């Protein structure tokens with residue numbers, strides 16, 4: 001049974017949606033890790049405590065170098081504590097601010113690491129949703145780590161149509177749209193559908209209206225255009241992304 | 253402002269999911285109507301009180317001879333009262349039990365009345381969901397009346413795919429599957445995908461596995477087969493159903 005008594009609390013790593021994250025050290029092993037404190041008060045009033053518990057159980061069994069490791073968890077009267085792998089190099093979003101934009105090697109290596117973790121979860125019947133640069137942390141070796149909870153595992157009837165008893169929404173096909181948006185932003189520095197207002201961004205996502213700057217090579221354009229399909233079923237498989245010539249030629 | 257003081261309560265018409273329905277008479281007009289009493293205690297604990305209020309506002313503006321008229325509504329400390337049009341001839345489900353099965357004239361006339369009410373709501377940006385025989389009441393002239401509440405009116409974004417910002421589920425295309433299931437049950441006496449167990453019914457809906465008894469004519473088979481498409485976008489429009497040769501030849 002884990003307890004707050006087992007950890008030495010250090011500097012705060014930052015503040016999240018429902019609490020704070022601290023650098024910590026397990027007292028017996030002297031092992032450095034991150035302790036994410038989530039207040040049940042604002043978790044229950046946001047209506048996400050049930051959603052969170054499901055996402056924590058799924059992540060507790062995921063072991064992949066490109067997925068932030070959840071070692072364990074515990075709780076008290078008002079808080080829930082998550083024992084997490086500490087990522088020392090920060091977020092990809094901030095690294096993209098430091099470098100303005102990534103080159104083709106770093107971009108293809110990031111896509112390779114993302115596609116490996118997603119294909120690992122695909123084999124483990126785990127599906128991931130939308131992926132942001134802010135939810136991507138970097139380990140000590142420069143490898144990225146998916147660091148969010150967006151994981152999922154998946155009489156009257158006589159009158160229901162198939163679109164209400166089947167499936168249905170949504171399969172492991174949104175992560176492929178995310179690979180297209182991320183790969184674009186990594187190479188360019190901006191998301192492909194960013195606009196001056198809300199409805200203009202909404203329209204350009206609905207019609208898939210994006211263009212490439214003149215410094216984006218044909219291999220990157222080919223990968224981004226195949227990932228960014230309005231039809232989810234026509235987006236590649238995760239194996240095709242890992243075997244794409246631009247990826248196999250530029251990935252580390 | 254309506255109040256329970258304005259009505260004389262008579263015999264109970266039946267018991268619903270969240271209350272009871274009574275025959276009533278407005279004291280000033282001596283007008284016979286039905287008073288549906290819904291207990292807020294079991295409405296709030298079932299998590300449907302918010303859903304119900306939205307469905308009641310939509311129905312309060314629907315005026316169609318084949319839609320059960322909602323005259324008004326009021327509430328007190330623990331109950332919500334719905335002033336409804338009284339249907340004297342009961343449900344189509346019970347009439348189907350009395351007649352075992354309907355002929356082609358009654359079936360086509362029922363489909364015509366259902367399609368008119370749905371096309372009326374389609375023009376009023378109102379969409380209806382699954383339709384059961386138990387939710388279809390009969391007026392004094394033998395016309396059916398839809399008598400349920402299944403009515404509806406319809407920064408991070410940079411990383412969301414179109415299948416999450418668009419639409420999406422589900423359009424006014426489930427009512428067309430309902431017309432196929434109802435038209436079949438009216439002519440046959442049983443829903444087309446009824447089976448001995450749950451998963452067998454689930455499978456035959458998923459694969460659209462249904463057959464016609466030898467007494468079902470080709471015109472009815474043509475209408476049912478076009479309504480019962482696994483692809484919603486390939487189901488007819490409500491105007492095609494009203495113009496179908498089997499409908500136009502048998503409807504009253």
Ligand SMILES: CC(C)(COP(=O)(O)OP(=O)(O)OC[C@H]1O[C@@H](n2cnc3c(N)ncnc32)[C@H](O)[C@@H]1OP(=O)(O)O)[C@@H](O)C(=O)NCCC(=O)NCCS
Nearest residue numbers: 013014015016017018021034084085086087088091407408
């Ligand atoms: C998105 C947001 C609400 C937080 O959401 P969240 O899902 O709760 O994020 P988390 O709780 O998982 O992590 C919060 C912090 O702890 C850090 N962290 C979490 N786990 C970590 C770990 N194992 N190792 C190292 N750092 C970690 C994160 O990097 C983050 O730091 P940051 O805020 O400096 O980037 C917050 O980032 C925000 O509002 N930022 C400002 C908005 C803005 O200015 N621009 C973006 C438009 S929305």
Ligand SMILES: CC(C)(COP(=O)(O)OP(=O)(O)OC[C@H]1O[C@@H](n2cnc3c(N)ncnc32)[C@H](O)[C@@H]1OP(=O)(O)O)[C@@H](O)C(=O)NCCC(=O)NCCS
Nearest residue numbers: 155156265266267268269270273286336337338339340343
């Ligand atoms: C579906 C069920 C739970 C009720 O759900 P509901 O949406 O709350 O139904 P309602 O509150 O709108 O109406 C309830 C009664 O009032 C009647 N009623 C409602 N409004 C009326 C009106 N304006 N005029 C006349 N009668 C009316 C209905 O006909 C119904 O009568 P019934 O139960 O004898 O058929 C209930 O019908 C049931 O459980 N039946 C038994 C199940 C069964 O044996 N077979 C079906 C498999 S589920």
